[PDB]
Amino acid sequence: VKDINRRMSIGEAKARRAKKEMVEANLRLVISIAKKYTNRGLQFLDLIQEG
DNA sequence: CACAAATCCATTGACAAAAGAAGGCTAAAAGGGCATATTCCTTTTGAATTGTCCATATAGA
Incomplete structure (x- = not known):
């Protein structure tokens, strides 16, 4: 489970990047x-902020 | 000074208006989704503080 969700958090952080x-x-x-x-x-x- | 009658205060009862609610409605208010390409805004005067040289005192050579 930790491998799974750690890969998950990696993917999400990369998307945010x-x-x-x-x-x-x-x-x-x-x-x-x-x-x-x-x-x-x-x-x-x-x-510009709401844009 | 007692007995006979007109005049007051109370419940029955019903009846109409009035308001609190409830539903049914409709105006309105708030989301959501848009794909040829858009790439950097329009008066002095004085005092106090802060940043800048100067006197100078001391420490090594």
Whole structure:
């Protein structure tokens, strides 16, 4: 059981590593799309964070 | 000063309005899911502290 779920946790940590990688890649895309909603009442970092 | 009658306070009872609820409804409020490609924002005055040289005293050569 410990071999099983340890392999499981390895796989999950690797997936989280990949997703961290890609999202850090595309933060720029988010700033690009978030520029345009600039002054509709919500601060800028609120927009980039919810993006 | 006793006996005969009109005038009061209490229950029966029913009856209508009123409210607490319950269901049935409908307006509305909140999720979820979108795949040609989108990649870095728009006036002084004074005091106190902090970071910068200066006097200087001492320790080795």
